[PDB]
């Protein structure tokens, strides 16, 4: 993985010494070649995970997420120099450095072999995101955002650390391959119940589960766009990925304690969706939609069914792409209006036809229009849940319904109407954002064409 | 103070600490403690303000009480055993009395109210000295006699230090007070890991020593004592605040920074000793320390604050104090995690 | 090697170099009361060097080329705005007073360093102890608010006590109506727009607190305009006074070391000039401070440490 | 208002100076060059060439091997009459049953 790690690390000196004008160009292009190199990592052996070294390995679950992060890295670079144009060169270089360190930590996380190293980099993603959210944020509760986000993450992270070190003392090693091959049945002891809770609740905090999901409507809504997309697209996937890794040594106990959280998500995905309907801000609506989709992924994880795992992975990838695109579109409109209430600027479909389209298939993919990978990922989870329990369907059946409502509602109330007369700053569509939504959208349908890649390790 | 006199007093403090860490006779260890106490008071009184007199007093009478208590323990041990050698206590009363006799010196138990007071009253440089050098000696004595500790007492001491330090740090805007409470919390961590493996205690002590050195000399180079004054440093000098926030993230122990390595290793040790509730408790309550660390970081670098016009002249003039070992100290303060197994060198 | 603790340990004292001729003087008086003239005359009559009256850009003179930096970059206040529009919400007047205080503070710092390092005496035009006369005279004229006055007093107490008063100070007594006639004949349009009450208040504040409290700190020499005209007599007066008043005699070499340590670190001297008090004319906003500091950085010779800026003509930076 | 603050700068649109602005930066030449580099690397060698790569990996999950061994053992077992698959994935004889 050092064919991807070493270039990512060496990307830091390039930006840190590039001229006052070349930082954006150089970072964008070289991150694009980094994504190209990581495109190779989609090469997967039939059943054996690709073990590059002792400390680094990859399989059909880590590789798609890694490719997602590496391909994403140019996208924040393209979305940031709009709101980062009027800044000192050193400050811009550090913003870029925060982004590269974030991507590097995500790569080491996804390619980590020992659970402790996975925890180290997984949590270590907090710091660059914290700096991005706090310093470069524009709204008020950004300072409150950082506190909420850090403390919510850590409150689950530390018990996970205690559980992992206890596992190391008892089992012998935290290596994934060992704990899977040398896996042993888990007894229904209450100490084992608390161990399962410690191993689960950190990822479920970052999932998020309903109830303890307040860090997203107070974090993604406030972060700069680059931070917002890197949060929603991948950082949410950290908990799902960790759960998929950890349920190997968390059975057969899970089912007995699967009952509270599963429905907590199942019911929660309704409320969040309902919360999406009666929203006032675009970014908050997208954040709550992300919460609902991630709750569906939670249900997929706790079913522990092959089909559930494949649908889960597909939903993570598709949701990352769709949420990043929706946040980018919201930023474009907000910057054009310097406000975020989704009533101030409506009826812009005529003014910006390409934005009107980009919003149209962004909503369609968010609404999971078949045969997009969003729809197949959702439907696989629906079928797995129905096999696990029939009634789930109606709740599932409710979700996209309400989702569809808001999935079109903002499009009705932001572009499908009459323009506001007193505003005039809406200029011609700068081709930067249009191109950015292109690099968002075309890979989505490309993966729709061949979903065997994002299908996960169960395929 | 005549510079030669200050040099001699510092040498006497260091010689007292060395006498504590090299002597086998109990009386010699007490003599080192006495020399340390005797030479410490003038260092605090160097600036000679009523705050300094107040703090030097409160320092003195607490340390004197602790040292007399330490004699009561030594004399009881000699009476019940007939040995001056620092091996272990042969009378349970003597050791369950010296445990707090050596505790007020560290300032971790409810015998901790003196620490924030003395820290705030005295100058920042002597505060660095008090919070860094004045803790190797009692910790060395505890390390030598760790074989015969009552674990319940020591663990209760460590828990109270952690809890009250983290909570008290939440309600102070003066840098000296919240650093004193942070020192109390780190005392709690090391003292908690003390009974099981003293090597982890030494590792945490070293990390805390270097990292507190870096923090305090950054404070001195910024010439700041209140939160607003430190916040004002961004206009005059931004790199200090930039390093400030990273060192504060290390204070909280957020990995992959250096500050995690003790907090990590300690947790790894006591869970090997079937202690599970305690490590979880400390891991959760370190968030109180982290909260005011992030509060300090927010109003130092992450949000630029209203400055003062006269700083136009402040930018015009550079610094003169060199602050030796600072750039190295930051490096060992943030990135030494990949060299974690090097802790075996201590063992 | 610059003077530090190692020099005292080595044996570098300052009582050895300091002699009777090592005197620090300030020549104080009303506006254009001939204080600069008389200061220069006592300077080269007694053989002592002369630092002129510190102004807006005296600190600009200290660092780098000495050219007066942009007014906005060097304290965003001008004496001309003081003279023309005295009462305005921007509060240029108290900014002027505070910047002048800090400039005179650094002037006194350098002056003290001079006669405590080489032993050559120093002469000055006004100083910290005469700085308050202006601010009080203005405040009495409906000029600034009492919060600015209290910030001035709090900065004075914590940035003047660590220094010690001069050796001798000469007052040139010129009547205020004569000062009004002198400013009439001067010609500069800005000093036309002066209140004669302000000049009388300067005179009052001088010989009501400055000279009285001076008399208990050092030796005062009140000279009339004609009396100060014949400079030879005033220099022979300052020669023969007693030179035995104040904290100057009871000043051991260790307190000499302390005061040299203080003067040699300019950032220490003006550290408390920027105390957080949040005064309406003192708080430069976050955005304004950011832009202005960036502007100061792009100014030549103010980006790196003095002696490292490659843009200005330095050399050997890569082995410096 | 006790806080010397500059007025909020106006929201400056890129089109006023060079109409050909691509919304990247002020200077038209580097703005245009960043256009060329993105429209090259994002689409040409990553989106298009990368799509040829992902559409044309080598054997994925050995599914083709799975089929080309599958019909082989169907031929064998169906020809000899043996059931085309065994209810046990492991031979019961070699498995020592407890008690």
């Amino acid at each position: 993985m050092l064919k991807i790690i070493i270039p990512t690390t060496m990307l830091l000196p390039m930006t840190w010494m590039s001229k006052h004008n070349m930082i954006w160009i150089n970072a964008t292009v070289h991150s694009l070649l980094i994504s190209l190199i990581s495109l190779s990592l989609l090469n997967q052996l039939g059943e054996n995970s690709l073990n590059f070294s002792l400390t680094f390995f990859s399989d059909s679950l880590s590789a798609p997420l890694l490719v997602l992060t590496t391909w994403l890295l140019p996208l924040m670079l393209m979305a940031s120099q709009s709101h980062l144009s009027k800044e000192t060169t050193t400050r811009k270089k550090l913003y870029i450095t925060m982004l590269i360190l974030l991507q590097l930590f995500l790569i080491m996380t996804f390619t980590a072999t020992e659970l402790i190293l996975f925890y180290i980099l997984f949590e270590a993603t907090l710091v660059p995101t914290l700096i991005i959210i706090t310093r470069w944020g524009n709204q008020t509760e950004r300072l409150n955002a950082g506190l909420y986000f850090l403390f919510y993450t850590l409150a689950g992270s530390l018990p996970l650390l205690v559980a992992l070190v206890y596992i190391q003392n008892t089992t012998g090693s935290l290596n994934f391959l060992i704990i899977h091959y040398w896996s042993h049945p888990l007894s229904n002891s209450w100490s084992n119940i608390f161990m399962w809770l410690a191993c689960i609740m950190a990822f479920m905090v970052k999932m998020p589960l309903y109830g303890l999901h307040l860090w997203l409507p107070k974090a993604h809504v406030e972060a700069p766009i680059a931070g917002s997309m890197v949060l929603a697209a991948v950082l949410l996937k950290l908990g799902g990925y960790g759960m998929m890794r950890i349920t190997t040594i968390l059975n057969p106990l899970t089912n007995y304690m699967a009952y509270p959280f599963l429905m907590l998500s199942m019911w929660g995905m309704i409320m969040t969706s309902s919360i999406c309907l009666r929203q006032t801000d675009l970014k908050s609506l997208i954040a709550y939609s992300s919460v609902s989709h991630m709750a569906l992924v939670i249900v997929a994880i706790m079913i522990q069914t092959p089909w559930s795992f494949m649908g889960a992975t597909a939903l993570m990838i598709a949701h990352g792409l769709t949420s990043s695109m929706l946040f980018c579109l919201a930023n474009t409109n907000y910057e054009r209006v310097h406000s975020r209430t989704m009533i101030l600027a409506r009826g812009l479909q005529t003014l910006l036809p390409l934005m009107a389209t980009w919003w149209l298939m962004a909503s369609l993919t968010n609404l999971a229009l078949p045969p997009s990978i969003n729809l197949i990922g959702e439907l696989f989870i629906i079928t797995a849940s129905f096999s696990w329990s029939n009634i789930t369907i109606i709740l599932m059946g409710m979700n996209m319904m309400i989702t569809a409502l808001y999935s079109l509602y903002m499009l009705i109330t932001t572009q499908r109407g009459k323009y506001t007369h007193h505003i005039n700053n809406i200029k011609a569509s700068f081709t930067r954002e249009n191109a950015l939504m292109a690099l968002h959208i075309l890979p989505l349908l490309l993966l729709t064409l061949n979903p065997k890649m994002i299908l996960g390790p169960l395929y | 103070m005549n510079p030669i006199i200050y040099t001699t007093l510092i040498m006497t403090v260091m010689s007292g600490t060395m006498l504590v860490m090299i002597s086998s006779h109990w009386l010699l260890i007490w003599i080192g403690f006495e020399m340390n106490l005797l030479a410490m008071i003038p260092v605090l009184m160097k600036n000679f303000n009523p705050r300094a007199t107040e703090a030097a007093t409160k320092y003195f009478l607490t340390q004197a009480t602790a040292s007399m208590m330490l004699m009561m323990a030594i004399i009881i041990n000699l009476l019940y055993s007939g040995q001056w050698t620092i091996t272990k206590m042969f009378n349970p009363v003597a050791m369950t009395m010296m445990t707090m006799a050596l505790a007020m010196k560290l300032g971790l138990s409810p015998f901790h109210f003196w620490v924030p007071e003395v820290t705030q009253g005295i100058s920042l440089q002597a505060g660095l000295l008090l919070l860094t050098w004045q803790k190797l000696a009692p910790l060395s004595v505890l390390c030598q006699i760790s074989q015969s500790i009552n674990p319940n007492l020591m663990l209760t001491m460590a828990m109270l230090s952690i809890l009250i330090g983290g909570w008290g740090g939440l309600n102070q805007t003066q840098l000296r007070k919240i650093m004193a409470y942070s020192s109390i919390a780190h005392m709690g961590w090391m003292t908690a890991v003390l009974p099981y493996n003293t090597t982890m205690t030494i590792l945490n002590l070293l990390i805390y020593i270097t990292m507190t050195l870096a923090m305090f000399m950054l404070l001195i180079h910024s010439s700041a004592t209140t939160t607003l004054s430190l916040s004002h440093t961004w206009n005059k000098m931004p790199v200090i605040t930039s390093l400030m926030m990273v060192t504060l993230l290390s204070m909280g122990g957020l990995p992959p920074l250096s500050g995690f390595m003790p907090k990590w290793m300690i947790i790894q040790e006591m869970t090997k000793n079937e202690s599970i509730i305690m490590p979880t408790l400390m891991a959760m309550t370190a968030l109180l320390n982290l909260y005011f660390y992030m509060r300090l970081a927010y109003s130092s670098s992450l949000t630029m604050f209203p400055s003062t016009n006269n700083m136009k002249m402040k930018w015009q003039f550079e610094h003169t104090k060199q602050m030796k070992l600072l750039p190295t100290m930051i490096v060992l303060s943030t990135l030494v995690l990949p060299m974690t197994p090097a802790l075996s060198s201590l063992n | 090697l610059q003077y530090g603790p190692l020099a005292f340990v080595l044996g570098e004292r300052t009582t050895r170099k300091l002699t009777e001729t090592s005197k620090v003087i300030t020549v104080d008086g009303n506006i254009c009361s001939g204080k600069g003239r008389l200061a220069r005359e006592i300077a080269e009559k007694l053989g002592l060097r002369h630092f002129p009256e510190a102004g807006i850009h005296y600190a600009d003179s200290t660092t780098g080329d000495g050219k007066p930096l942009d007014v906005q970059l060097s304290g965003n206040c001008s004496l001309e705005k003081f003279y023309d529009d005295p009462k305005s919400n921007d509060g240029n007047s108290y900014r002027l007073q505070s910047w002048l205080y800090a400039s005179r503070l650094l002037q006194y710092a350098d002056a003290l360093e001079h006669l405590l390092s080489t032993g050559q005496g120093v002469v000055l035009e006004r100083s910290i102890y005469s700085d308050f006369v202006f601010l009080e005279a203005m405040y009495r004229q409906g000029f600034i608010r009492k919060q600015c006055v209290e910030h001035y007093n709090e900065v004075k107490k914590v940035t003047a006590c660590e220094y010690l008063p001069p050796h001798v100070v000469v007052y040139v007594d010129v009547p205020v109506p004569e000062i009004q006639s002198r400013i009439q004949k001067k010609g500069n349009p800005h000093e036309m727009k002066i209140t004669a009450a302000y000049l009388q208040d300067i005179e009052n504040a001088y010989k009501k607190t400055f000279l009285p409290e001076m008399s208990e700190k050092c030796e005062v020499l009140q000279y009339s305009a004609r009396e100060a005209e014949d400079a030879e007599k005033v220099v022979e007066d300052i020669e023969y006074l007693k030179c035995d008043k104040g904290p100057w005699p009871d000043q051991d070499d260790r307190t000499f070391h302390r005061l040299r340590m203080l003067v040699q670190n300019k950032l220490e001297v003006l550290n408390y000039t920027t105390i957080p008090v949040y005064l309406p004319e003192i708080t430069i906003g976050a955005h304004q401070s950011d832009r202005v500091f960036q502007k100061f950085t792009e100014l030549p010779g103010r980006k790196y440490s003095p002696g490292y800026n490659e843009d200005v003509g330095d050399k050997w930076i890569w082995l410096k | 208002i006790r806080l010397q603050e500059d007025p909020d700068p106006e929201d400056e649109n890129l089109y006023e100076k060079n109409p050909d602005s691509h919304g990247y930066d002020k200077d038209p030449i580097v703005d245009l060059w960043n256009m060329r580099v993105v429209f090259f690397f994002g689409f040409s060698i990553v989106l298009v060439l990368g799509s040829t790569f992902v559409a044309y990996l080598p054997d994925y999950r050995m599914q083709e091997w799975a089929r080309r061994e599958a019909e082989r053992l169907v031929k064998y077992r169906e020809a000899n009459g043996l059931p085309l698959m065994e209810s046990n994935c492991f031979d019961p004889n070699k498995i020592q049953l407890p008690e």
């Binding site: 470069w136 944020g137 524009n138 709204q139 008020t140 950004r142 | 939440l170 309600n171 102070q172 805007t173 209140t226 939160t227 607003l228 916040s231 509060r295 109003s299 949000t303 630029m304 604050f305 209203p306 | 957080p276 949040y278 708080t283 906003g285 976050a286 955005h287 | 006790r2 806080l3 909020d8 700068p9």
Partner: peptide, 26 residues
């Protein structure tokens, strides 16, 4: 223009303690 702390935000913790009570008093 992102929110940069102003005077009233600065005074929220600049003095005694940032959790004022009657015990803080003066």
């Amino acid at each position: 223009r992102q929110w940069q702390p102003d005077v009233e935000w600065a005074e929220q913790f600049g003095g005694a303690v940032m959790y004022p009570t009657k015990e803080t008093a003066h």
